[PDB]
RNA sequence: CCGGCCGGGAACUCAAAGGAGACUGCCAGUGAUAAACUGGAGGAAGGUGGGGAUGACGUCAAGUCAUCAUGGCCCUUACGACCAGGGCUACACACGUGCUACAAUGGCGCAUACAAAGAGAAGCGACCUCGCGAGAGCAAGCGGACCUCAUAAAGUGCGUCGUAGUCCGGAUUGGAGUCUGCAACUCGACUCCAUGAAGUCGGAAUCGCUAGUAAUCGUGGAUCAGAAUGCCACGGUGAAUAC
RNA sequence: AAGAACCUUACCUGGUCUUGACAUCCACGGAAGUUUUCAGAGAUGAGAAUGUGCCUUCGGGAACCGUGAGACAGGUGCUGC
């Protein structure tokens, strides 16, 4: 009927939905050619319908928040691979394999106080 | 120094705040300043009786002092009268009224306030400063402690140089967040200088 | 590391040539974390040499980076005292990544005109052997066989 | 209608003071939604804790203010009356909005 | 190319062309060529004389080149004159918007000496 | 520069000169405010500016108008 | 900090709210755009001297109230940077626990 | 009327709470019949998963008497106390820490993308008008997942300059202003106009950094009438290398 | 120093004050206050009007103000050996 899955690579937070048609995929109203332009990769969204082909067989309604190019589109990967979850196991061997739906946790780290930004310290004078 | 303030670190976790009331930005240091006039007053005054800590609630303009003292007796005096003294002149500078309760302390040699102020009574009586913190770290060992470190650091015995010395007896691990640890300090202003009486009492692991 | 025998970070294929190789040169010839900017230069010259070359962009970009490899380079150690210079067999994962820089480094001089066509005569040159990246590796050759003496 | 809101310092003080009101309201006159959380507003401070010199060293704090909602759908008798006069609950703030 | 006082450039957009006029910059400039009536893409190569013309009467409008050199002249000149903070700061060559004067005033102070 | 809602003087220093201007030329006026403008007025007196330790006398021109008194009393001595 | 520096502060204060906080039509109605742009404007600058030098909130220094120190100032809890941290662990402030994130 | 606007909906993002979960627990091998460890399952996460807080006994008679407390020693028509200015902002010079540069992975225009974390009642201040712009009026709303500061910028997409002390740099000076504020000259910030300095990657030396780290682009807050390139936080794109 | 135009400000110049700007008292006279004028850089000094309250031992009050008197108040003065 209509599955669904998550994924929130980086502050940002993928919301896909999945159902069998149409091989287009829609996103925030707007087309996936348009929306992600020239960046890095359009296609890391595509990468996970990939050992699970897609062709013409399942439409993607897409909706997400946050974060900016990178951080979306790895958002959209997890979610989508979270949401191919309608031959539950059979497709989950050969995907994870490939990494995938791995969370891949690593946020920002918190300036610290002292240093200048994270782990940049400021200089040193010895005299 | 080098030391994280005991009470604080576990201020969320295993302690309480002793200030207990919420405000909004606007009103907040005016706030937080009459609760430490009524605290600074009301310590002061009451110096015989005997009291550790002064807990404070205002619940919609109303200000609930509770003082927890190893002397009751001596806080209210005769019929409650001396309640009704401290009702008055705490309600003025605070803010309009006022509802003093008071907690009993039957085991004062546990609490880190009154053995501190105790040790601090007896160093400016020209009593040896060992025979003060030895005592002390001994008599609450045999009521009901764990641990009670007990540091003196300045002059003591009229010395040239100012030394640091401690005698604790247990288990006193200010490193676990889950022990609950009375920490108290005070000063003792002698005619040589002052001499701080930092004090640990380890009661319960959580 | 000391004693902490980890190993390395998976990358990621190129869009429009889907591989590994060139990925790598990216992210060297990259600044400011800018792989926006630098995908879109290594594109341009691959285009461009492809062009001239009358190949491909992978067997192009191969038949250049093999042109300007290192087979030996040259480390000093001092075992007992002195230091001297003993030269090495480069590991195959450095191997190829120690030709990327050395192409991209010369490409920051010789200013022609844009990145993308210093890339492209920097790669071009290296296909015939005669540029300032395979003079990196030549004189780094020199060394090796000159002091060839120490093991 | 009337919406109920209400805040405080500690997460866990702010739980039973919501729960108490709610169910003085809920029992003695029905209806309620229930605990609407809302976003805890974390007022940061970096002070210096050296008295003189030592800018690398600081002690970093937080003041935690809870929210909470409570939304009734109706005003009725039985329950508008609870909720003036019969508040209580020391260390959490309360502001009833019609 | 010729107008003003100098210009004479070429090879170079019209807008960026009379920056090289000592009293008109970037801004200036297009509002010259919008009251003109002439596009800010072309050349003065590829302009004609008859359209050149509308340009000197124009910057003509505005003070420039010995026009305005004498009256910066005059109004530093002024300050030296009346003995004022500002005066005695330009004479002494030193600077005048209430910098720094310690460590850096390089520009002002011209390069480094000797002690 | 600021200030367009009226060229500020203090007070005491307008109703000074106002009185030396009607009465006639005198001596310098012993004045501290640096921060008074100079008036068309004041053409003519030679008012006294506090530069710090001392009065140092200006006679006041045509020029000095929109600047201020503080302008023409240097206060840190160099060299 | 100075029993005169915190003495001299509650004049500051005092004189403050007196005049400034009620007669800021001196300064803030009178100096505007309109019909009084004249000589009434003027009279206005005039006699918002006639006033004494304090008064104006800007001359505050904004000191802690315990201990008077005029630098390492907090708004919210009225308090200098050592104080707030001595009351802080201690439990004074509400709520005010170590952060960490 | 085609904007979560609308009834409405309780799935999802999210917001909070309270629970599950990762313990070398399972698996083989190396091992001393250990402790381990090396790989391997599953898992969102794997051997303290990442980051923070947490700082032993004591060292430097380390710093602080100027936050506060404080023993002595000192001053009392003064080293006490109120006020106007001036000064802490001086400038042959030397160093420290930054920022902005020296360009073409760039500069400049016109388009348009996607954040987070904050903050606000003598407050933050829309929307509309006046402004070339700082800003100036009128004033909506919000003690706030409601209102506002607030279009994030890098980034795309087209244009145009074509290696020049340049359409690079944006110093310095002159003029004309703006707000705050009794008051802007010593001594503010910002704007406009014109001006257009050094600088073409830096001697001996030398610093930080082991992944969402360095690098680079915005953003906020605290103190604060006004006054960050500092400090404290926040999130974009996002490397190289560790034999 | 989590932000020096005055303030801050501890420093300088000149003006100035000595129970003092901040405190409790022994007690002399007045409600407190508010509006407003003059000389002065301003601190200050000189006024001119109005108001004249909560309890009566009513020779007094509980606050506030300004005198004389001393217990003194005050010091970001030195000593972090
Ligand atoms: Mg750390
Ligand atoms: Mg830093
Ligand atoms: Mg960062
Ligand atoms: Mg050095
Ligand atoms: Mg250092
Ligand atoms: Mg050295
Ligand atoms: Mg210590
Ligand atoms: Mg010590
Ligand atoms: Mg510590
Ligand atoms: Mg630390
Ligand atoms: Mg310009
Ligand atoms: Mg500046
Ligand atoms: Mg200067
Ligand atoms: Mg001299
Ligand atoms: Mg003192
Ligand atoms: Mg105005
Ligand atoms: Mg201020
Ligand atoms: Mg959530
Ligand atoms: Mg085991
Ligand atoms: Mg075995
Ligand atoms: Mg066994
Ligand atoms: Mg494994
Ligand atoms: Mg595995
Ligand atoms: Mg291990
Ligand atoms: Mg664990
Ligand atoms: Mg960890
Ligand atoms: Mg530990
Ligand atoms: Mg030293
Ligand atoms: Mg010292
Ligand atoms: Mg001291
Ligand atoms: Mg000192
Ligand atoms: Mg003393
Ligand atoms: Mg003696
Ligand atoms: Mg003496
Ligand atoms: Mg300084
Ligand atoms: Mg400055
Ligand atoms: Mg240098
Ligand atoms: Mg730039
Ligand atoms: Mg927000
Ligand atoms: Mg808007
Ligand atoms: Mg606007
Ligand atoms: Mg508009
Ligand atoms: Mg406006
Ligand atoms: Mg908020
Ligand atoms: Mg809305
Ligand atoms: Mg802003
Ligand atoms: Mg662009
Ligand atoms: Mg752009
Ligand atoms: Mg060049
Ligand atoms: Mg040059
Ligand atoms: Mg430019
Ligand atoms: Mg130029
Ligand atoms: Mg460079
Ligand atoms: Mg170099
Ligand atoms: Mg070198
Ligand atoms: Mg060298
Ligand atoms: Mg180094
Ligand atoms: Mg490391
Ligand atoms: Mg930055
Ligand atoms: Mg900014
Ligand atoms: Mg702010
Ligand atoms: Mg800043
Ligand atoms: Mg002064
Ligand atoms: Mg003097
Ligand atoms: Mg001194
Ligand atoms: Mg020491
Ligand atoms: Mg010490
Ligand atoms: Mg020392």
């Not at chain 3, 974390?33 to 070359?53: C, F, P």
């Not at chain 3, 093999?66 to 002195?82: A, I, Q």
């Not at chain 5, 004389?49 to 305005?68: N, S």
């Amino acid at each position: 009927n209509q599955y669904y899955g998550t994924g929130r690579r980086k502050s940002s937070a993928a919301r896909v939905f999945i159902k069998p048609g149409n091989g287009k995929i829609v996103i925030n109203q707007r087309s996936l050619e348009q929306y992600f332009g020239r960046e890095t990769a359009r296609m890391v969204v595509r990468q996970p319908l990939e050992l699970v082909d897609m062709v013409e067989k399942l439409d993607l309604y897409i909706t997400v928040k946050g974060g900016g190019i990178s951080g979306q589109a790895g958002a959209i990967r997890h979610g989508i691979t979270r949401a191919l979850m309608e031959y539950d196991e059979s497709l989950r061997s050969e995907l994870r394999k490939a990494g995938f739906v791995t969370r891949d946790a690593r946020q920002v780290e918190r300036k610290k106080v002292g240093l200048r930004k994270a782990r940049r310290r400021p200089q040193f004078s010895k005299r | 120094g080098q030391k994280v303030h005991p009470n604080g670190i576990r201020l969320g976790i295993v302690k309480p705040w002793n200030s207990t009331w919420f405000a909004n930005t606007k009103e907040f240091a005016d706030n937080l300043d009459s609760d430490f006039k009524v605290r600074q007053y009301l310590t002061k005054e009451l110096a015989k009786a005997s009291v550790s800590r002064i807990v404070i609630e205002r619940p919609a303009k109303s200000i609930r002092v509770t003082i927890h003292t190893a002397r009751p007796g001596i806080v209210i005096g005769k019929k409650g009268e001396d309640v009704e003294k401290l009702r008055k002149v705490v309600a003025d500078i605070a803010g309009v009224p006022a509802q003093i309760n008071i907690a009993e302390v039957r085991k004062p040699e546990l609490d880190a306030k009154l053995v501190a102020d105790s040790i601090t009574s007896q160093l400016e009586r020209r009593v040896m400063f060992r025979r003060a913190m030895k005592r002390a770290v001994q008599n609450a060992m045999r009521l009901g402690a764990k641990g009670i470190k007990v540091e003196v650091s300045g002059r003591l015995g009229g010395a040239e140089i100012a030394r640091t010395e401690w005698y604790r007896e247990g288990r006193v691990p200010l490193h676990t967040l889950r022990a609950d640890i009375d920490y108290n300090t005070s000063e003792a202003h002698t005619t040589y200088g002052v001499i701080g009486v930092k004090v640990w009492i380890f009661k319960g692991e959580i | 590391p000391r004693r902490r025998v980890i190993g390395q970070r998976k990358i990621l294929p190129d869009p429009k040539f889907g591989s590994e190789l060139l990925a790598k040169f990216v992210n060297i010839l990259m600044v400011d974390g800018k792989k926006s900017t630098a995908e879109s230069i290594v594109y341009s010259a691959l285009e461009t040499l492809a062009q001239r070359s009358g190949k491909s962009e992978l067997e192009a970009f191969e038949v250049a980076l093999e042109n300007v490899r290192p087979t030996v380079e040259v480390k000093s150690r001092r075992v007992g005292g002195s230091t001297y210079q003993v030269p090495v067999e480069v590991r195959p994962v450095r191997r190829n990544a120690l030709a990327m820089r050395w192409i991209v480094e010369a490409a920051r001089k010789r200013g022609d005109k844009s990145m993308a066509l210093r890339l492209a005569n920097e790669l071009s040159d290296a296909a015939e052997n005669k540029g300032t990246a395979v003079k990196k590796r030549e004189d780094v050759h020199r060394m090796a066989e000159a002091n060839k003496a120490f093991a | 209608r009337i919406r109920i809101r209400l805040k405080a310092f500690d997460h866990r003080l702010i739980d039973q003071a919501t729960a108490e009101i709610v169910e003085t309201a809920k029992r003695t006159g029905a209806q309620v939604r229930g605990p609407i959380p809302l976003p805890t507003r974390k007022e940061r401070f970096t002070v210096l804790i050296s008295p003189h010199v030592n800018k690398d060293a600081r002690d970093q704090y937080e003041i935690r203010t809870h929210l909470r909602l409570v939304d009734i759908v109706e005003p009725t008798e039985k329950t508008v009356d609870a909720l003036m006069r019969l508040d209580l609950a020391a260390g959490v703030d309360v502001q009833i909005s019609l | 190319a010729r107008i003003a006082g100098i210009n004479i450039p070429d090879h170079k957009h019209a807008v960026i062309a009379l920056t090289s006029i000592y009293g008109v910059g970037k801004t200036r400039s297009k509002a010259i060529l919008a009251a003109a009536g002439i596009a800010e893409d072309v050349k003065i190569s590829e302009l004609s004389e008859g359209q050149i013309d509308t340009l000197r009467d124009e910057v003509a409008k505005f003070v420039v080149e010995g026009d305005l050199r004498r009256e910066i002249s005059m109004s530093i000149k002024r300050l030296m004159d009346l003995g004022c903070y500002r005066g005695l700061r330009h004479r002494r060559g030193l600077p005048v918007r209430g910098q720094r004067t310690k460590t850096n005033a390089r520009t002002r102070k011209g390069p480094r000496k000797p002690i | 520069r600021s200030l367009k809602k009226g060229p500020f003087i203090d007070l005491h220093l307008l109703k000074k000169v106002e009185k030396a201007v009607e009465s006639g030329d005198k001596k310098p006026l012993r004045t501290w405010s640096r921060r008074s403008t100079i008036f068309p007025n004041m053409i003519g007196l030679t008012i006294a500016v506090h530069n710090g330790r001392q009065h140092v006398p200006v006679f006041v021109t045509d020029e000095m108008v929109g600047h201020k008194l503080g302008e023409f009393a240097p206060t840190r001595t160099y060299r | 900090a100075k029993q005169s520096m915190k003495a001299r502060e509650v004049k500051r204060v005092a004189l403050a709210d007196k005049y400034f906080a009620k007669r800021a039509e001196l300064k803030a109605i009178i100096s505007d755009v309109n019909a009084a742009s004249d000589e009434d404007r003027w009279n206005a600058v005039l006699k918002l001297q006639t006033l004494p030098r304090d008064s104006s909130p800007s001359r505050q220094r904004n000191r802690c109230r315990q201990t008077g120190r005029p630098h390492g100032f907090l708004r919210k809890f009225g308090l200098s940077r050592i104080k707030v941290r001595e009351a802080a662990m201690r439990g004074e402030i509400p709520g005010l626990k170590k952060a960490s994130w």
